[PDB]
Amino acid sequence: HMKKWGDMFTWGVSTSSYQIEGAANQGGRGPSIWDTFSKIPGAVANGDNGDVACDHYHRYNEDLDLMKWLGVGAYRFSIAWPRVIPSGYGALNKEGMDFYDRLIDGALERGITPWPTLYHWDLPQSLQDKGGWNNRDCAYWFAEYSQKMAEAFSDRLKNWITINEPFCSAWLGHLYGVMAPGIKDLKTGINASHHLLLGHGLATKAIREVSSELKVGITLNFTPAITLGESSEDKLAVELADGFDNRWFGDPVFKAKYPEDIVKAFGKEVPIHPGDMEIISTPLDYLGLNYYFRQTVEYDATAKPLPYKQVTAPNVERTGMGWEVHAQSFTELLERVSKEYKPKEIFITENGSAWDDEVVDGKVDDPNRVSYLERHLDAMFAAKNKGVPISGYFAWSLIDNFEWAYGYAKRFGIIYVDYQTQKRIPKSSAYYYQKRIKES
Amino acid sequence: HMKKWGDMFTWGVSTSSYQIEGAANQGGRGPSIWDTFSKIPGAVANGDNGDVACDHYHRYNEDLDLMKWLGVGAYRFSIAWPRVIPSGYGALNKEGMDFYDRLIDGALERGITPWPTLYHWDLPQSLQDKGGWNNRDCAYWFAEYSQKMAEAFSDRLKNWITINEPFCSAWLGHLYGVMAPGIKDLKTGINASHHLLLGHGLATKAIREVSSELKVGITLNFTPAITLGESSEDKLAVELADGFDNRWFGDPVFKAKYPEDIVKAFGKEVPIHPGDMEIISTPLDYLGLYYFRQTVEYDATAKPLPYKQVTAPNVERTGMGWEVHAQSFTELLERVSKEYKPKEIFITENGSAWDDEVVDGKVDDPNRVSYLERHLDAMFAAKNKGVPISGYFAWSLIDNFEWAYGYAKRFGIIYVDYQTQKRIPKSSAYYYQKRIKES
Amino acid sequence: HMKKWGDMFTWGVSTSSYQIEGAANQGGRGPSIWDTFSKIPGAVANGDNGDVACDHYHRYNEDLDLMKWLGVGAYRFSIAWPRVIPSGYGALNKEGMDFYDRLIDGALERGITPWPTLYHWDLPQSLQDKGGWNNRDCAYWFAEYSQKMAEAFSDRLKNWITINEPFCSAWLGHLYGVMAPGIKDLKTGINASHHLLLGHGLATKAIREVSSELKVGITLNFTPAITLGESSEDKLAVELADGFDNRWFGDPVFKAKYPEDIVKAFGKEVPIHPGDMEIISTPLDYLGLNYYFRQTVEYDATAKPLPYKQVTAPNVERTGMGWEVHAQSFTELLERVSKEYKPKEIFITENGSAWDDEVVDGKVDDPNRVSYLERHLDAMFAAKNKGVPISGYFAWSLIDNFEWAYGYAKRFGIIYVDYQTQKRIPKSSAYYYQKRIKES
């Protein structure tokens, strides 16, 4: 579609606060729902928790130095709500705010643009005790927190993201109960999805009120659905899975409505107050898109809440997570999102892969991660060359970290972390990404 | 006209000697006309002068470090003629030459290409005492100075600019008297304009004689003119203002003549000697080129030409009162390329001034960011239409002495606290840094 | 064919081991055929040898720093076979391997990708004593050495080159005797050419057995031929020169045969055994192309081994070597190679020029070298814009060095070396190349 003079492209890396910071009970930080969830036997593999993680709260200068060495222009990170406002609403924690000031200022000194995500799943436990995302007030608590962060940091930080992956917070956290807070109820999942999206919209309006030059987006993960079957019911299964994973969150933001076919199949009411859909669909400067894999499904009349099930397709390449590797789906997803939702521009805020890494002679050679990265960058640029306005790519992740219910066993870093010593070791994929940033 | 393999683009920042150096009476430097002019009550806002400025004469390593941090590939700077030859013609001041050697070598060690401008308005007072640019000999004194600078520095410096903005030196300095040397006489302004341009041409030839690989250009500022009226006389007002500001200097360089409509309206003769117009129009490797457009209307009573400036209502303006209109930048670039067809164009200055505030040791300047974003976009719009724009130099790296406005008008992407000389990068510096890396 | 999003380009510099390392009798290194050849009166101008060279064995950190300062992404270097296996086949010299480990790891710390060449003319004398490249076993000795290097270093080094410029090793080393080992016999040159090419193929197969992600190529120099005459015999001279210099080595690699017109004109048998041509023609990930100049020739019935002679065409620009400067030939060569041999991609592994340099006030201003570089980069990008898959460019050389039989008098560096002090002084051409790397 013709690269032209003046066009820009941003290369970054991505992390999140609970997954890397540690210092969970230091620096005035209050507990999050993941501190609580991680204390429940069976919730997280190996009984892992984020108490220490990568100790980035103390080691951030080293990690910023690794970012400068990589040559990224941008760093996508999240602010830990319970580190800066431990009670959820009310008093700012000065020690927590000072940490993010030092992080931001350190990034800027090194030429790196920080990209803050306000909510990456670490809801303060003080707010969960009041109902969390099931409580409509949580959307307003989130918007007030967002306003305070923009008041503190938007003199420097101009590109904001409100929430990350509401699919995970709503459905995995409140319907399937495999993420914090561990609730298993469809109606609660529906309420949570609405208040996450309403929070997004209210926070967007609050940030824009701080200053009109600020840019705001949302990060959505999309899981394209296919079926191996040919029956009419298996084609319906694809539509249902696409509606559950993708359109449930994208349609409110970009079309100001929930997908009617899924609303009907649930048979429950979304707690929409007058004015809510206008707030949720407030115009955005960009979409942050997360992509890792496609899902294969088939019809299943017995399944709940919707009559389809996951299938493990045979004879396909898979990562250490068991996730199918299929880069062509990334190209097609990007084209589809641009056509159906027409975001002004798209940033890939997460893409990456996990494999079993081995340290040999103090080094980590990870050719399968390199291969996934190469093929997904190629697929992203194929979409850009067709005219999709992809303005940057952020690798998940800079460093190995706490992979939620999988714990530390699943390593997404381009830089290895030895958790016994906290040593950082760049992998082969780090050298590859460094080259791609420079030579593209 | 899209990018092809091998195409290059240069990102830079720009300063000038009197505006940043300081050390005005140190290191053997002799006075310039701006040292004198800055001493006249009422000439400069707040009684400011360049005695200290940004103290860059002593702090140049810090400023070079800031350039490397920004990631610029080039640094446009000027050589202070009265620092290197205090008497204007005659002996070199070795201490002054050594300063520019240290500056140049420090830039090259950091990977930065210095782009020297030989004349950015600081004529030695020693030469003003002999008539300055009113004196035809000043063109030759300038060419000899230029030759000596190329002999000293062109082993390293391959891209030269002779003079900067003769509009200001000639008309603002000798007709309106609002810039040094402060003279107010049309014939003097005409003489100065011709001898500035002749000096440009003589210096170009002198530099090329030093080495055939050297490249040379001139820097012209252009101020596109519009009118809000529809009468034929308001259209004439646009022509007169365009001729006075732009064609008076562009036509000699690229067409070997002065614009006849302005010559006729002046009613005076340009002091053209045999050979002059061949010299002035000598081929250039590039044009150094913008801040704003002017709005005008006819005024039969105005002098020297029958037009006056108009302050249009409800337009966006900088802290200087200058209209912000980036589309005019695109159209100017297209016009210059068609009208004068320079081999290539470098934007040697573009930028904006706004009231900056230090808050918590930082400077957030969104209006300057917005001006910069929109003018880079407008520049690339012209490049994508085929205009051969090969680079862009932001005015300025640091806040500095803005001539008759003094220090109150801040053009830097890096703030200077004049009490302490601390440099504080503004939001616009981080924006520019990103643009340099990610384009 | 214009730039599209995602396309990459690699900027590098090139050196070779014997030409820069020095430490010839230190660190356990055994002698090479160039140590021997350089001791023969008359073999090398001024009696020069590589005993000390640029002392890069000790000064590599400074040279790597200069690469980082230039901004190159890649460093093409060669491994000295007699430094790492002094006996040619048998035991590794751990001290020699540790040097290449330090070099590689230092390059990677600086963000530079090392591109190893396994054979750049410094055959162990221990193997020359057994016949060198005249002996078929040398192809297998080379493959065993190559396997050992890939086993040691391919955890980090993913892009390999087997041999460099077999034209020089075979014909200049064994027919004209002007390069080591100094033999002057057509049959020996034919045997050597075949065993170099077989060694390439065997080494390629051995490297790929180490790991399937590794990439392998060969470096060939091509010297395009023209004539000033119009006679049919002068047109035949062009064909003969092209066959001798270029097709003799390119045709086996890409067409699995030797050029029949040259075989017939030699009147000798190439010692081809079963399996050899399949091995020599094994698919490659890229061609490393070296180009410096074109040759002008005319028919000469008295000349041997083929009836043509070199002509010094009148009134053309020439370097300090006496080599014609004609950048348009570089564009046309790249187009011809892409059509005739169709390599998957091409890296310019060497291009550059030598001129008499003068140090003035501690600096070196070399406008003729700048001009050659500018014009040849322009010519290369002209071919890329026509669709030739040129993926990178490596300047010969980072530093002035031992120019084989010309000794140290011929300087190819963009960085000057004062051999009395070993001081490195960047030339004007270094600043030009630094600018081109950044601003393209």
Author numbering:
A (entry chain C), C (entry chain B): 0 to 439
B (entry chain A): 0 to 288, 290 to 439
Task: Provide passages from the article that reported this PDB entry.
Here we report, in contrast, on a naturally occurring mutation of an otherwise invariant residue in the β-glucosidase BglM-G1 that balances a trade-off between structural stability and enzyme activity. β-glucosidases are enzymes hydrolyzing β-glycosidic bonds in substrates ranging from glycosides, to glucosylated flavonoids, glucosylceramides, and oligosaccharides, releasing nonreducing terminal glucosyl residues (see Ketudat et al. for a comprehensive review). They are also one of the key enzymes in the bioconversion of cellulosic material. The otherwise invariant arginine at position 75 changed to a histidine in this protein, while the other 36 amino acids deemed necessary for the function and structural integrity of members of this protein family remained unchanged. Our data indicate that the natural mutation to histidine at position 75 leads to the loss of an extensive electrostatic network, including a salt bridge in the active site region and implies that evolution of BglM-G1 traded a decrease in thermal stability for improved catalytic efficiency.
We, therefore, re-introduced arginine, replacing the histidine 75 in this enzyme, creating the BglM-G1 variant H75R. This variant showed enzymatic activity and characteristics highly similar to the wild type enzyme with the same pH optimum and buffer preferences, optimal temperature, and comparable substrate specificities. Overall, the side chain and backbone topologies of the amino acid residues in BglM-G1 and its H75R variant were highly similar with an RMSD value of 0.069 Å over 1217 Cα atoms, confirming that the mutation in the active site did not lead to a substantial change in the overall fold. There was, however, a major difference in electrostatic interactions between the mutation site and the active site nucleophile. The naturally occurring histidine at position 75 in BglM-G1 formed only a single hydrogen bond with the backbone oxygen of threonine 116, while arginine at position 75 formed, in addition to hydrogen bond interactions with residues Gln163 and Thr116, a salt bridge with the catalytic nucleophile glutamate at position 349 Fig. 2 CD spectroscopic analysis and X-ray crystal structure of BglM-G1 and its H75R variant. We then determined the melting temperature of both proteins by monitoring changes in ellipticity at 222 nm, while continuously increasing the temperature from 10 to 80 °C. For BglM-G1 the mid-point of transition was at 51.4 °C (324.6 K with a 95% confidence interval between 324.4 and 324.8 K), while the melting temperature of H75R was at 54.9 °C (328.1 K with a 95% confidence interval between 328.9 and 329.2 K). The variant H75R retained its activity at 45 °C over 40 min, while wild type already lost significant activity (p value = 3 × 10−5).
